[PDB]
Design a binder for this molecule. Structure first.
Ligand SMILES: Cc1nc(C(=O)O)sc1CCOP(=O)(O)O
Ligand SMILES: Cc1nc(C(=O)O)sc1CCOP(=O)(O)O
Ligand SMILES: Cc1nc(C(=O)O)sc1CCOP(=O)(O)O
Ligand SMILES: C=C1C=NC(C(F)(F)F)=NC1=N
Ligand SMILES: C=C1C=NC(C(F)(F)F)=NC1=N
Ligand SMILES: C=C1C=NC(C(F)(F)F)=NC1=N
Ligand SMILES: [Mg+2]
Ligand SMILES: [Mg+2]
Ligand SMILES: [Mg+2]
Lengths: 507, 507, 507
């Protein structure tokens, strides 16, 4: 027998019979998975008969204990005791947890997807681990009573385990993880205070349904025990010098970055001007087949603008297209909590991939963070940490938080809370979505060993800067706009940030 | 809690929510049958989730103990332990019995329908009761692995509970039992030594799916603790006197029985000739729709004869019709273990209803008993007993056994073994299917107070007696037949048995 | 038996047997509706056998005569003669009018939907009443041979009734009327000379299909004999004074109204800036679900721009949305008579809800009127009264007609003809879609107590004034645009209407 503090939840394998490829057995795959790094195993039989169930639990319990890996059994507690399994794992509609413990003394997993559930797990006291929500969409779970909750929904849970100090309860992520997201799920599924993250990733069809369980399992292992998530080929690491702003503007000019705008029509003419003005080239393509090719172009950058007529399967593909190539996405959730359809949509978009920067104004940034002038600072930090990103917040003061944290993940440095991440301010006195376009361009020109945080900061300066200049040569809102673009053009051409009006301080 | 000795299996109610009539509830029904008959209650939930299960099992355990009746739980032993059930009932493909008892110490049931299963039950020594095979076909059990077994099947199981002598184990019959067959089932489901019969009848749909459980349970009860099954409207209760054979032949003549022949085309024209001899009326309808109107007609009799190219859907329809009217049925299994399709077919027919007589010869009688001359006696006895009927076996001698037993059933008198039942013999020195036709005519004309056993014997005599007479006036196979029909005519007209050739002894 | 002049058309209920809620009878509905407001019944049986039809017309003619209400029969006139009915309603495909009149002498209703039908109903002399076209789409008319016509088409018909002086003819409108459109139908369905209006509303599925005929009938009555259609939460009532254009430009700035533009691409970026310059906020949403939320936002306003790629179902949704909250809609039929598809689409939109302003040019406004300088005034005035709206005609001069008549409606003050309404004009000497956006913004800012008319005027002035000024400060097409926005910016900021170039006269 094992002990609670002996279980290793790193790569937890949940089983499925009707899914194994033709000519391969359940024993066949599960072995391949043990040999190559699976570290816990659940047997899951929703359909078979109590006798065959047992017959195969004994055949697989043997296989496991030979690799010194435990064996949990799904919702059939009796079967579990029957065969001396090492733990059972029940969901929300199964046997109450108190009753389960009154027939065993041994490890229990509870399927949680909501904070309220964690509350009750705690009004119980030392339930030993929990499967966290359905992170993504998956057709492995027949007739499901929840919904793809996202990494944000899984954070909301990790966070309730801290409010409750439920130190005793481990966690695993489950529901549609494959190598195209495992990294991002590990990377953002962390409590705000930074003290706790996931204890392990849990797959079913990525191994069970693989032609090559061996190969597939070695990959997941590889993602799982690595600690740097390099999501965009730019460095992620002390105020921004003028000479830094400089070479940033040099690189972006020397590189002619192609910036793909998926935005409405209004922001569209304007945006492509600002991009052009910065020595870059806009592309307003929202065509799905094309998305793979644009992103492949050198120094290519994507700009996202909630509610743009483009169908979500295409924003999904767009985002994905670019994280595949390690390239920068800037996200501008214009709408947000303004409406029903928009809250819902952004939250969906935010689960499609990793963003390099999210820009919004006081209302937008406050909504995203789930919460003045001090308060703004607070919420920007909150959002930058919560989506692991550079998060800009605009207004008279622009605040710029860096929550990427070098791009480090782990299974519980993680220790750097929300409130410790560096955040700056940019002021120029009293004077939109063209900010998006600016940042996008700045970031897009940066070379390998460049820097993401400085780049965004340069962008917010360059923009706020041009704002003053234009603000002073306008005759009205009409001419301000054409002057704003002009200023942006002249400003980046005379590369002398030392002569710029906007002052950059610490938040 | 209860004790194994206190469980009453009289009327055993098994549960099924997905079948309950609109407007009514499980509690609804399960209450009604508690007030009106049920004596034991099993919860069956093959679909619902482990929580909901427990919720409704607790809700019903209270409803039961409220009537001092127990509550068994189907296949889910943990749910039993959890809610403090009084027993669990598993299947052949559910948890092994060893493992179950290693979790509990409380009653266990076991669904059986094959002597080998009883053989193992026995090599375990004191498993507590068994649900006996599928008796009849039922669409309540979704996707089944057995096949309906009939009373013949149930017997073969009871018969292994004595061979292995498992005093300690009780039995209930299950599946397809309705009011149209509970009597017949109770009646012929007794062990071959008469000692052990069923201890309970077990229904699911006859109550649960009833637009009035209250009424339906009252009726089921009425049957189960009644003790006389009067299947034919004739008496059933010391050698046959010449005066008895005489008033038998008068009755059939003064009654002109209508004898419906469902038989092949070669015994067809013949048998009609015999029936006509005996002052009866042949009708040869293998029409389904007509069957019930034919049985209406006064003193109507039915004669079956395997392999008559009427659909079994008709033979079922037909047999049923005459038992609903308590009229007699002669059964002749011409074919039998001669081929395959025949054995199959006869066995299915034998499950359709209750026969007043089963005639056959040497090969047939021996096949039916599942087993010379002392041997035919022992075999005729077995057949008679087994199918609770008067059994004629033809040859040199004709042996006639009476295994009806006044129509008695019990839930374990029943103790009147095979060997004991009355068996006579009729000889007449060295002299076919017309016997059946004759037997049918003799039984047909008896009135409520007449006696089935005598009627048959008269038949065999009369016939055996036309035998001698025609053997004498024949010139070969052709005229022998025409003199046999002729003799039969003369013999019954000059009704004076005091003169006929054959000797009736005591086998 | 009633008289011709004793028929109360107010609320004319038509029958339908197949559409009645399980549990209620036809008697039930009709009765219910009788007590609560119905003033005429017509039986309608396109299916049932003439015996059963009749059993029902009597039963029902009784229930009607008890509440002193007449009963008409549809098209089966013999059935009317047969049961002593008060009138028959026939259609266009039914028995010629003369032939009916030759067999009865009684009241006769005719389903009309085009002027031609009126011309015929005219050169016949004293047909009693007509049922007017199909106003809105409906599935209660199985296999329809017409096409929904809208209140627009209904007016065409009401106008042939004057060109013909058919003073002997009543009208009722029929076809898909429910509480979300009775008011509007009652309000705009009036003769071009205003001398004639509708004599009642006819509903089928609203009462007959209601799960509460009682309540549905009370509501409909409530609306039919009210006299105020307050359709926009603004005033509706002597040249517009400088002080007023000034208090107007304040309300709009101080209230920053959210203006939703459903327009193409080319009026999008441009239109958004005009909105911006006016201190109000652009929303480019063509999202079908947001549209309810957008209109719940304060001082919110909608601008339609025919042909905008937005699906017609969305335009309906959107238009409905704003009327349900009483917020103003600005309609700009750019395309119009230009093509086929456009003319078609524009008329579909016009019958969707109630607009507060329709802007358009010489071409557009001449088209809408179904019809220089003395001419545009005559046409502008028409388009205002026909669609009960403040209607603007851009050109060298700009013409504004207020045809909303305090929002009054009747059953025939109605009498204030196309010519009578106020029409003012706006000159600035010899100097695009911006005007819509401007007017949308003036109207949007207006509070409970404002006045839709002045607001519209203000906008036109402000837009015209802006023109003279940019026409002065421009060096070409492009500069002109940007100078136009600026002038609106400046002009409104220094809210000083006394000093504007454009002169406001009576037209
Ligand atoms: C068995 C099970 N429970 C889930 C939950 O949502 O909590 S997901 C899941 C299976 C999904 O895994 P995959 O996509 O790797 O097959
Ligand atoms: C649950 C179950 N087991 C069976 C077996 O053949 O062992 S039959 C059966 C259900 C049959 O019930 P009814 O026909 O009365 O609805
Ligand atoms: C019988 C009949 N003729 C119509 C026409 O348009 O001429 S409409 C109509 C019935 C439709 O009523 P509702 O849509 O209010 O249920
Ligand atoms: C619904 C489930 C949720 N979580 C887990 C796991 F993490 F594997 F324990 N298994 C499940 N079957
Ligand atoms: C398959 C079954 C067989 N027998 C019984 C009973 F007899 F009631 F115990 N219940 C079952 N569900
Ligand atoms: C087709 C119809 C048109 N109009 C009317 C009425 F309500 F009488 F005006 N009834 C009809 N059945
Ligand atoms: Mg479960
Ligand atoms: Mg079972
Ligand atoms: Mg008609």
């Amino acid at each position: 027998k094992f002990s609670k503090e002996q279980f290793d939840y790193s790569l937890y394998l949940v089983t499925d019979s009707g899914m194994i490829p033709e000519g391969k057995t359940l024993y066949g795959q599960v072995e391949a998975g043990l040999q190559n790094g699976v570290t816990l195993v659940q047997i899951r039989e929703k359909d078979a008969d109590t006798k065959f169930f047992i017959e195969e639990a004994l055949q697989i319990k043997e296989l496991c204990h030979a690799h010194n890996v435990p064996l949990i059994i799904n919702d059939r507690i009796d079967v579990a005791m029957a065969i001396g399994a090492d733990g059972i794992h029940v969901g929300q509609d199964d046997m109450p947890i108190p009753m389960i413990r009154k027939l065993v003394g041994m490890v229990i997993g509870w399927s949680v997807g909501f904070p309220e559930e964690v509350d009750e797990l705690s009004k119980m006291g030392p339930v030993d681990y929990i499967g966290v929500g359905t992170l993504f969409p998956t057709l492995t779970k027949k007739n499901p009573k929840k919904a793809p909750m996202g990494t944000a929904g899984a954070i909301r849970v990790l966070d309730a385990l801290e409010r409750n100090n439920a130190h005793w309860c481990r966690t695993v992520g489950i529901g549609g993880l494959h190598p195209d997201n495992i990294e991002r799920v590990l990377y953002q599924c962390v409590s705000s205070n930074g003290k706790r993250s996931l204890d392990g990733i849990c797959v079913v069809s990525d191994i069970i349904a693989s032609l090559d369980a061996a190969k597939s399992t070695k990959i997941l292992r590889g993602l799982i025990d690595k600690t740097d998530y390099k999501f965009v080929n730019i460095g992620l690491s002390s105020l921004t010098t003028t000479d830094e702003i400089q070479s940033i503007i040099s690189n972006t000019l020397k590189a002619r970055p192609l910036v793909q705008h998926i935005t409405n029509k209004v922001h569209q003419n304007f945006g492509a001007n600002v991009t052009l003005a910065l020595g870059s080239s806009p592309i307003m393509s929202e065509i799905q087949s094309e998305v793979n090719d644009l992103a492949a172009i050198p120094h290519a950058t994507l700009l996202l603008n909630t509610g743009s007529v483009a169908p979500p399967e295409m924003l999904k593909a767009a985002i994905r297209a670019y994280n595949d190539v390690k390239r920068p996405i800037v996200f501008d959730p214009v709408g947000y909590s303004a409406t029903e359809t928009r809250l819902l949509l952004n939250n969906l978009l935010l689960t499609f991939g990793q963003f390099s920067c999210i820009k919004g104004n006081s209302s937008e940034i406050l909504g995203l963070a789930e919460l003045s002038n001090e308060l703004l600072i607070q919420a920007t930090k909150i959002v930058a940490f919560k989506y692991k990103t550079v998060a800009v917040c605009t207004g008279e003061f622009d605040f710029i938080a860096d929550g990427t944290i070098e791009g480090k993940y782990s299974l519980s440095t993680n220790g750097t809370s929300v409130e410790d991440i560096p955040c700056v301010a940019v002021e120029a006195g009293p004077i939109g979505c063209s900010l998006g376009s600016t940042i996008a361009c700045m970031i897009g020109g940066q070379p390998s060993e460049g820097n993401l945080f400085h780049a965004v900061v340069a962008g917010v300066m360059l923009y706020k800067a041009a704002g003053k200049i234009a603000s002073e040569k306008c005759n009205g809102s009409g001419s301000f706009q054409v002057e704003l673009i002009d200023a942006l053009y002249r400003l980046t051409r005379e590369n002398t940030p030392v002569t710029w009006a906007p002052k950059l301080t610490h938040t």
